[PDB]
Structures are given as structure tokens and as C-alpha cells.
């Protein structure tokens, strides 16, 4: 439902990636005589760090203004914006950041520090196994960052698990704990709203089929901060049992 | 589904705002010569404690009469009530109220203190990427009014997480956050009821498509009661480890 | 679906409510040459507690067997019954009573005490943005008694909320309100599973529109019973911490 | 979608039951010319503890041979389980048991002591305000099975609701509550994941009304389940206070 | 819509498994001019610990690449993972693994140790009342596993409802407890995310009938953890009210 566009006017020289999806599952680089629609997205993977990225986000015609700034660092929580066609999200993993516009025809995606979880979809769309529309991607993309949180997740609680078995721990350890554990939840929160929401809204990119997905994803991620919630407030308790072995 | 109307019958001098929603995102200083229909409908922003909008409340017929009472400041707690064809909604945000009565052909809102979150519905349809139906503007609105509370809800955690590290707190500064914490669940409960209920209750002017974000922002809301839930739970218990630092 | 009646056939005297529903939002007084069907519904609000009431009651030909005994004020428990056509619903506010029969022709209630519920409801039809079908009727009467539920559970909360503002409370205050909370949840759980029932048995004179809302008030009136559980946790907490004084 | 039978190839003489449903609310004894299927579905009653019922139950043709067996009480937790056409599920209330075996032609089931549950649809086909298919059949016993855990759950919340109005309970009597609650929970669980269940597998015999019904059940038996847990937890409690006001003395 | 295959191409020798469902709800042992397709599709199960089993695994076109590995053992965490066409699942019961591969015409599923949850099955689809398509089958497995694990955590709490009854427990016998009850919750709750997870993406291979069954599975095997949670929280309370009995002595 949208103008089809020319393969040139989205050429950034040192873009990190910038591919055309085949929506068959795969990719290939993107030259000047291929034409961009919803059935061929393209995905531009810039470093907004870079000089000819961050000069191509302030200039190109492709993005409304308000978007620039933002796709430009600007942000810090996770949201979901609209941009009348276009849509923004800010999303967090493991704190890493993603800024990420996008429209059905395309996906334009800013990083600074690397995102494991964007490499996932590259190293699947180079294989031939990865998404076909935009928003097949976005949900894979929030699959990934979930699937990151929910290790990470299982990791704290791992060590949580241990230090409750006490013989007590080393000065301050359970303090890091807490500050990771909090950090996680200050942000995982609102990201979950954010699925949970793409998961409501109806975007012309994606189908009763993907918001079912981002459904799961956000109810998945909800219940990581349950478990959150619990190694929080146990680590309250720890920190009695603690301060009282050290009393009688 | 309703009766077109004149762009006269809806004018008021003082009125804040007066604008003719055009369908795309955008809007227009309402005219005399403008029509008024579920495709364009018409927004009156009153500030009901200036005359010729408290006047124009208790006087013009596009409004039932049990509506002009409450619309007028009779209302505290949040509430959807319905009056047939319209609908009398009753917000609070941050404590600050707003009241609305809606049908598909206008939006009537009045507040006294100002209210941050119809201003980014102002701020949005000058710019072009506003609501577009009723049913639509009412959705923003309570994003809005959420989004409000959800960081303010972030901000007092922030606050009751670090009195969590613990020398102790200035004396009755623990008393002046529960009497937020418990303010705010009086009335972010009601009031998301009232974001279910919209969810629920089919109206003309509201699409299968709103209905799915009342529902997001009533659930989301929801989590909320339950941060707060928490957050009190939380100094009633550092009131204790407190009587114990002092005992 | 159901055979149309004479607008004789359900005349009491004594009735203190005996209206026709227009099914535009109003009402007016059930004379002899009115006819009831589904389109127009006829509701009667009988005191079960007058003579010319009570003895409608047991004659009338209007109702089953079973329901005459609990419409006449033997049931104590919220539950829906279905008798076939019709269905007896016993429900509670604020502890007042309130048994209705009804089908899509008619509504038939009865109660002994007053119940600010069913009042909101006459104000609405006599202005004339009230219910139309027996269906709506019935969801805007549970909206009403679970408003005042509700509201009254607020009040218990904002007054638990004083006393853990403590300065200990009069000898035998927290019993009053632990005492109140617990009537309160006796009733209020039944009440919820009735209203989620009515939500998904699918009854001739419900539309899909009106099983949505029964939903609302069950899943809402839900929340309001964890609100007590909470309310009674932190009245047996209070005592612990005032047997501490 | 099924064959039809013959009147006699159910005929047991001891049968507690032996129903035909109308198809409008009520009964009929069955009698060897009448014809049963889908829309007048057979209801047979057994004690599988009488001689004429058990042997009827081994040998009669009209039950595979896995459903026998447990037909025959070598069953204890509730559970569905699906015998192609036909359909094996155990219930229990109050621990009282029920096993029935079920297709759209008719319902076979089998108890030793007697179940309030199923005297109430009995009581209601006989008066003609009853079921009229084998789905809902079964929603109204699992209803009543059902009204009847949630009673006698708040007859037990209302004993704790007394013993925490505390004066000491007599030895020994906060045993025999948690005891009692434990068991509920034991059984009421599976049992719920039972009417849960036969709320999503599609069989021919319910309609997509009748699962609306299993899914209130279902979730509503589920909320007993957290009352149970509540009432538990809080009898663990006033052992604790009980053992303070006997170390306090 | 997938391409049909001849029987000769999915021929393994000590493949302890080899079958093609009837789809009526049984089986025959796999010989060279069947055809498989979703109708009737192939059930390999592999011990990857096998010499032809492994060397199958590791060479037959029938598998995409990144698959190899994991269904050789490589996996631990329960997950599903897509491979276009393909599915590759990992799952755990009782800590033993499973892992299985599988589009609408074929499954292949390799275990190390033997799994109850995969006999099942199999005593079912030999006798006539298993399932009849892939997605039945992926059912009819994952209801089991859970089953299972429903079952040995009644027994956790069975123990643990005794300990609660207080005579200390035996040294380090809380321990063992609360360490199965942890290692369950480790893997149990992953394997949620995958129950409900299938029952959200629509493979082809599954209908809206068995994505409602995946749900009851998940909310299922849901509600478990919940019940683990509660006893490892009362684990941890057990161990305080006992550092307390061998304080005062
Ligand atoms: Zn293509
Ligand atoms: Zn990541
Ligand atoms: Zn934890
Ligand atoms: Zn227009
Ligand atoms: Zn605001
Ligand atoms: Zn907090
Ligand atoms: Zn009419
Ligand atoms: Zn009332
Ligand atoms: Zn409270
Ligand atoms: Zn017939
Ligand atoms: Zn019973
Ligand atoms: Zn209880
Ligand atoms: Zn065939
Ligand atoms: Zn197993
Ligand atoms: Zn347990």
C-alpha cells in the first residue's frame, strides 16, 4: 500500500549491512537497479557512530524529523512511536541499545555497541532461514532479545540459588546482584509493554499471525520479571539472614 | 450513524480549543460554515472556570442534562457512564481531573488545572499525526494519561529503592510517599475499571481495533496497581526494620 | 422465540413497579391491551413481603414450581438456576437481597428490602436512558450492585488504611471491619462465579454484546475479592502488632 | 455420525438406571424397540459392585477392552482419556468416585457408594428440566460436582475462619482440617485439569456452547483450588501461634 | 503441500523405530514402496547412540544442516527452533532428553536414554488410538511429558507435606528435595515457553483444534511451576524453623 522505491536511494557507504530480503527467507546486498516494496524490504543496519551513517540519518529524505534525533542516540526507554506510517522503537538487551524505524517497505536499524540478537537474524538470513517481511523480522528480532533476557535471567537466579546455601558470601556481592537484578527490571518493564502493545496495535506490516507471536514474546518476557521480582525480594531477605548470623 | 450539525451550533468565544478533526491526522479552527460528522468530528477544549465556557456549559443543547452537572466539576472519582447516544468519561492523571463527554460526532472536554496529556494531543494534531475518529482520540488520551502514570510510578520506586540503602531516612519523609503511593492506587483502581470497561462496552465510535488498546492500556495500567501494591508494601516494612534501627 | 402474552395476565395491584420497556430506553405503565414480547419486555418489582404480592406469587401461572418457593425469599446463596425458558438468579449488595426469574418476555423481582441497585435503574428508564432488552436489564442491574460493591470496599480499605496509622485503634473496632470484610467476601465470591456464568452460558435473551460486559463485571467484581483478601491479611497483621502492645 | 442400536443390546436387569433421553429434557426406562443414536442418547446407571451390573460390564460388546477394567473402579485420579469414539473419564467429589465411558450415543457410568451429583440430574430429568445430549449430560454433572467442592470449601474456610478467633482449639482438630484440605487438593487439581482440558479437545458430542460451560468449571473449581491453598497455608500459621501460646504457656 | 517421498529413502537398520501412520490411529513397520506424505507421515525414532542411527543422523539429505547437531545431543535447553520448512524441538522429562525434527510428512526423534513418553505412544499407535497426524503426535507427546512431570511433583509435594509434620528431618534430606525441585524448575520452565509458543506460531502442520490443546498443555504444565515455587519457598522456611529446633535443642 506503499510507493515503491529505486534501489540507489538508500545506498550509505560504510553501512554496516544493507540488504534486500528476497521473502523467500534470505538476502542480498543491495545494488542500485532493485526495487523495494513490502514484498522486498530493505534493511539498512547503520552504526550511528560513523560518518557517512550519521551524516546519511540527518540528511536522507526517507526519515520524518522527529525520528532523526532519536534514531541518532536520543533515546533511553523502550517505546513504540507512530510516525503516522512509519513506526520507531527503542528496544534493550544485555545495557546494549537498538533504535529501529521502519515502514512496510523498510527497516532502518541504529546501533552503537554491538546486539548479539541482531546478528542472529543475519546469520539466519544468510542462511536462507531467516525472515521474509518487516514484520516477521521485528518479531524474530524481539524473539531474540527475549531468549537473552530469559538466559541472563536463569543465570542470576543460578548464582542466587548458590549464595542461598550459606558459610557467608564475600562483601558486597549480593549488592551487584541487587543492582543487576534492578537494572534489569528498569528496563525490562516498559519493554515488555512494548511488545505487549505491537502486540495490540494493528500496523498494515504485520499479520494476526505475528501479533499472536508478539503476544507470546511479551507474556514470555512478563514472566521474566516475575522471576525478577522474586530474586529481588530475596535478596532483601539475604541481606537480613546476613546481618544476623553476624549479631548472636 | 447521527445527525450532521452546523459549525455555529458549537461555538464558544473562550473555549481553549474548538477544532474540526479532518479525518487525516490533523485539524482546523472550527468555522461557521464547517460540517460535523463521525468522519470530521469536532473538539471543545472548556476550561469550565471561565464564564462564557461555564455558560455555554449550563445552556447549550448538545448536552443532556445529568452531564452538565458533572462536566461542569461535580465528578471526583473516574468513571464511563452513558447517557444513550453519549458518553460521560471522567479522568485523573497527575491530583488533576478531566472531564469528557463524547459522541461520535464531538469530543467536549473540560478541566481546570491543566492537563499535560491533552496537550500532546494538541501537540500531535498541529503536526499532523494526531487521532483521526473519536474512538481513536480517546485511545491516545488514555495512553497518555498512562504513560504519565507509569513513569511517576517509575520515579517513586526510583525513591523508595534507594531509601532501601539504609543510615536511616529524615524523619516523616517515608509518610509523604506512602500518601503517594496510596493517593495514586485510589485512583489509578477506578480508573482502570473504567479503561477495561471501554474495552468491553461496544460503541458506535469504536473500533474492534480501539477496543484491543483499551484493552493493552487497562492491563498496563494494571501492572501498575500492582508496582504500587508493592511499592507500599514495601514501606510499611522499612517503618518496621525503622522502629528497630530506633529501638 | 417465545409465545407473545395480554398485557392482563401479569396485573398485581399492590406491584410496586409494573412497566412496559419501549426498547428505546424507557417505559410506561403495563395497562391491560399492551403486548409483551421480546421486543417489549414487561418487568415486575414485587415486595414479596405484601399480601397482594405474595399471593400473585404462588398463583400467578407465570412461573415454575421451583421458582415460586425461592422468589418468595427461601434462598440465602448468589446462584443461577435455569428452569428450561426462564432462569432464577438470586443476587446481594449492601446484607440485602434481591431474586429475579426471567425471560426474554419478562423480569420478575423480588425483593424485601430496599436496594439502592434496582432504583438507579427506574431513575434511568423514567428519563429514558435505560435498558431495551431483558439481556441489558440485567447487565446494568449487576453493573449497579457491583459499583456500590466496589465503593464500599474502598471505604473498609480507606478506613484499614487509617488505622495502620498507629496510637492503637478502640478495643474491638478491627473486629467490626475484619467482621465486615469477611460478610463482604461470603457473598461477593459466589456473586462473581454467577456473574462469569451468565458470561458464558449462552442464554436466548443475551447477545455476544452483553456476555462481553458480563465478563467485565465478573473479571472486576473478581479484583474487588482480592482487594478483601488483602484488607483481612492486613486486619489479622494488625493484630499482631497491637497484642505486640 | 455414528450406528445406530437396538433397544435390547443394552439391557442389564439390576441397572440402578437405564435411561433414554427425550431430547427436550427428561426420560423414559428403556425398552427393547426403542431406538437409540445421537438425538435420544442412552443413559445406563451401574453399582459395578452388584453381580448382574459387573458381569454386564466385562461382557457386553459396547466398551473396548481398556475401559472395563477401569469401568470395573481400578481407577483412583481423575483424568479423560479417549478411546477412539468412545471416551473414559474418572471424576470424584465428597473421596467419593465415578467413572463413566462415554460416545454421542450413550453414557455408561459406574459408582460403588452413592454421588449426590448424579441424583440431581436424575431429579431433573424426571421433572423434564434436564439434559438433552451426552455434552450437556456431562456439563451439568461436572457442574453440580463442582457446586458441591465449593460448598463444602467454604464450610471448611468458615471452621478456620472460627479457629482463627483465638482461647486454643482442642488437640489434634487442626489435623484433621488440614488433612481434609489436603485432600481436596489432591484430587480437585487433576480434576480441574480434567474439565480444562475437555474444554479444548473437540469431540463430536460438544458443542463449542458446551465448552463455553467447561471453560466456567474449569476455571471456577480452579479458583476453589486457591482458596484450598490460602486455607492451608493459614492452618500452617496457627500452628505456629499455637506453639507460641504453648512455649508463652 | 509438501513433495511426497518413497519409502526406501528414510531406511535405517537398527533404527529402534521405522514407522508410517495409518492415519486412522495406527501403524506399519516402514518397507520401500510406501509413500509418505502428510496423510500418512513417517515416524523415525532414533538411539543417536547407535553406529547406523548416528551415521544416518550425520549423512541423510532428509535433514538441513544446523539440525545434525542437535539432534545428535548437542542441545540441552528446551526450544523450538525453525528450519523453514522443518521444526527442530528439544524437550525434557524425568534429567532425560529428547530431541525431534519434524515437517508435515516425516518425524524424527532422537533419545540417548529411553523416555516412558515416547512408549506411550507407541503402545497406543499399536493398538489403534494414537494419533494420525504430525501435529496430533507432537500433542499426544507433550501431553505426556507433562503428565509426567504433574505427576512427580504431586510426589515432591507428597514429601514435603510430611516433613511439614515436626521430629526433625535427616541431615541433608531437605537438600535433595529442594535440589530436585530447583532442577525441575530450571527446565520446566523453558519447556512452558516452548508448549506455548507452539501453541501461538501456525505451522502448517497443526491445526487451530491442536493449538488449543498446546495451550492447556502449557497453562498446564504452567501451573506446576507455580506449585514447585510454593514447595521450594517452604523449603527454605523448613530450614529456618529447623536451624530454630536446634537452637533451644
Ligand atoms: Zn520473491
Ligand atoms: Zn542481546
Ligand atoms: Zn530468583
Ligand atoms: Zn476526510
Ligand atoms: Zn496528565
Ligand atoms: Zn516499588
Ligand atoms: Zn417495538
Ligand atoms: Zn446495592
Ligand atoms: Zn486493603
Ligand atoms: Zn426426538
Ligand atoms: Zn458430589
Ligand atoms: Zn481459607
Ligand atoms: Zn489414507
Ligand atoms: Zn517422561
Ligand atoms: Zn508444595
Redesign the interface.
Known sequence: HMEAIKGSDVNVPDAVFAWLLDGR?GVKPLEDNDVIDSQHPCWLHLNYTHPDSARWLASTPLLPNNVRDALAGESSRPRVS???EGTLITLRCILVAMRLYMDERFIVSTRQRKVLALDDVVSDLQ???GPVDCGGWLVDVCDALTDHA?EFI?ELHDKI?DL?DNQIPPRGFLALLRKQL?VMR?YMA?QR?VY??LA???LPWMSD?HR??M??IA??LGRGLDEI??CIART?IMADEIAQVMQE
Open positions: 527467507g507512530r510516525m503516522g542462511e536462507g532461514t530469559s536463569e540459588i542461598e534492578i528498569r516498559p509493554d505487549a502493545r495490540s496495535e494493528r499471525d499472536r507471536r503476544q507470546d507474556d514470555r521480582d522474586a532483601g
